[PDB]
Design a protein around this nucleic acid. Structure first.
Ligand SMILES: CNC(=O)[C@H]1O[C@@H](n2cnc3c(NCc4cccc(I)c4)ncnc32)[C@H](O)[C@@H]1O
Ligand SMILES: [K+]
Ligand SMILES: [K+]
Length: 543
DNA sequence: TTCAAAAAGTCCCA
DNA sequence: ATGGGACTTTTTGA
């Protein structure tokens, strides 16, 4: 995963541009996932320029025979550059690349082929740079995950990622007054799994700068969203973070010769965040958005979690075995008591759901194999081998033809609100048709004790408003270009209000629902009603 | 027993 | 061929 050169140079310049080579001519620069040496080779070039530009000052202050230009190459490799990686071939290539920068006496190069997370590191380091590996909870082998849970528990639990541990290792082995700069996924900035990691970073290092690329495609043909984190262990009372957040995700990364030109430009916005004021959540927004977010939080007395019951959709474990088109002839084998309406995330619009085109065979209600042999033999059994490889089938908890996570039917077969799990905008709809769905659609229904305060029509009105689209996206988890995570761990934290505008907001919502359900939809008037509703909500929240 | 999180997403076309 | 757009499964720890 080759890191773009402009970012590599920026990271190295970040850690080394103001190093006092005269005061300390023995800086230790480390990359614990160096690979072929994208960062370390640049570190060599930056160090070599630094030594040659101060070669005569060094010669005068120290051993004058040791400090010559001819001796710079040797000194850098013996005492300055350190790298670690698990790939033997990459280390071998990097060793040759460092050697080719210039046998006399066989210089030794501090490159280790090892697990960076298991190595007994004999000393701390002045500067650490690089791009660690990212491995999620699905693609990480179970034997290694037990080690991470037992030894890296301060940052790695549950659905945490591998690069959390590289953050902990880098922070642990950084010298006092040292500087670290890495490029990692951005998701830990907001994700629920990153809470322990954020607590660790906040209370161990001073975060100098965060570069957030949002959904920009930094790595070509890689579906990941990146950020650059720069931190130090310097004694300072400032504790203020420079945040450079991109404004246009469509931009290409090579607009200028250097990254810092892009950051200072009109493609990025800059603002400051007080690190001491960071809660367990990192709300990195400008003053206008902070005021906007704080107004809504203070004005709203209730949250969605207070008034609603949230649940994830069906997880069959093999969709091809249980989901059929409503026009599929094989449904003539299945009694209608077994069939449920099935929708995908794209079927969720604002305020209403598209008509179902798929049916779910709720195979849990099938009592035994002998009574409905045709359904099992001709429909579900076509994927029996894959069905039996599901975890709950291996342990015997689930029968091979049963849904892996069937949930409760009564939760779905009722009036409820559904929203897609990943979307570019708020899309909350009222479901009237007892729709079932997979985990790409989340549902909630209102608690009985809050039905006389909040109706479904009022909720979809304010939740689909432009005010709440901006409001939710302030702290939402940015996944990829024009995609946010609409998950209960943040959707249920949305705060809602009840005031003098309740009735008209609800009435406008009913009008929109009435038009959206017509045969000849005058979608233009829906937009006009939405604008009027947004004005009511902004009036209610005083913004 | 059984909840919900997780993009080095995935797949496609031009 | 690559880059950009539409769309989103089930494995997994707790
Ligand atoms: C996306 N970028 C990479 O994967 C690079 O990082 C190196 N890289 C991976 N993982 C490493 C590690 N520890 C974790 C580890 C080790 C062994 C098995 C397992 I599963 C996990 N330590 C040291 N370099 C490690 C790789 O060799 C590439 O150059
Ligand atoms: K001298
Ligand atoms: K991206």
């Amino acid at each position: 995963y080759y890191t773009p050169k402009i970012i590599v140079d920026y990271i190295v310049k970040k850690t080394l541009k103001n190093h006092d080579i005269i005061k300390n001519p023995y800086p230790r620069i480390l990359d614990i996932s160096c690979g072929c040496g994208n960062f370390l080779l640049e570190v060599y070039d930056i160090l070599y320029d630094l030594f040659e530009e101060n070669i005569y000052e060094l010669k005068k202050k120290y051993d004058e025979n040791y400090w010559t230009v001819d001796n710079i190459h040797r000194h850098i490799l013996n005492y300055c550059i350190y790298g670690a990686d698990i790939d033997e071939k990459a280390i071998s290539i990097l060793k040759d690349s460092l050697t080719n920068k210039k046998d006399e006496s066989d210089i030794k190069i501090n490159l280790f082929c090892c697990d960076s997370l298991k190595k007994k590191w004999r000393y701390k380091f002045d500067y650490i740079v690089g791009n660690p590996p990212y491995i999620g909870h699905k693609k990480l082998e179970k034997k290694y995950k037990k080690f991470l849970l037992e030894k890296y528990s301060e940052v790695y639990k549950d659905k945490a990622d591998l690069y959390f541990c590289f953050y902990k290792k880098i922070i642990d082995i950084l010298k006092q007054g040292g500087i670290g700069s890495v490029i990692t996924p951005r998701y830990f900035l907001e994700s629920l799994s990153g809470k322990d990691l954020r607590e660790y970073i906040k209370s161990n290092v001073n975060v100098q700068e965060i570069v957030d690329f949002l959904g920009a495609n930094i790595f070509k043909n890689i579906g990941v969203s990146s950020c650059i984190l720069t931190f130090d262990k310097k004694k300072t009372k400032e504790t203020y973070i420079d945040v450079f957040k991109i404004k246009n995700e469509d931009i290409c990364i090579n607009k200028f010769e250097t990254l810092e030109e892009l950051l200072k430009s009109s493609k990025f916005e800059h603002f400051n965040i007080n690190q001491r004021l960071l809660s367990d959540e990192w709300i990195l927004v400008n003053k206008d958005d902070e005021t906007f977010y704080n107004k809504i939080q203070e004005k709203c007395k209730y949250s969605l979690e207070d008034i609603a019951i949230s649940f994830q959709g069906i997880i069959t474990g093999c969709d091809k075995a249980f989901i059929l088109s409503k026009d599929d002839v094989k449904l003539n084998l299945v009694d209608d008591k077994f069939l449920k309406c099935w929708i995908k995330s794209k079927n969720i619009n604002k305020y209403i759901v598209d008509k179902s085109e798929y049916r779910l065979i709720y195979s849990n209600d099938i009592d035994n194999e002998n009574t409905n042999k045709r359904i099992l033999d001709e429909i579900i059994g076509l994927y029996k081998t894959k069905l039996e490889n599901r975890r709950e089938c291996k342990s015997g908890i689930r029968k091979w033809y049963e849904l892996q996570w069937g949930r409760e039917k009564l939760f779905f077969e009722r009036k409820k609100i559904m929203y897609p799990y990943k979307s570019n905008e708020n899309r909350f709809a009222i479901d009237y048709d007892n729709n079932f769905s997979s985990a790409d659609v989340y549902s909630f229904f209102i608690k009985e004790e809050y039905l006389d305060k909040f109706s479904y029509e009022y909720l979809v009105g304010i939740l689909n408003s432009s005010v709440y689209d901006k409001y939710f996206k302030i702290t939402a988890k940015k996944m990829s270009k024009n995609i946010y995570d609409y998950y209960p761990n943040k959707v249920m934290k949305i705060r809602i209000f009840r005031d003098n505008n309740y009735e008209e907001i609800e009435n406008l919502s009913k009008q929109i629902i009435s038009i959206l359900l017509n045969k000849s939809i005058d979608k233009g008037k829906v937009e006009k009603l939405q604008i009027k509703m947004d004005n009511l909500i902004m009036d209610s929240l005083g913004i």
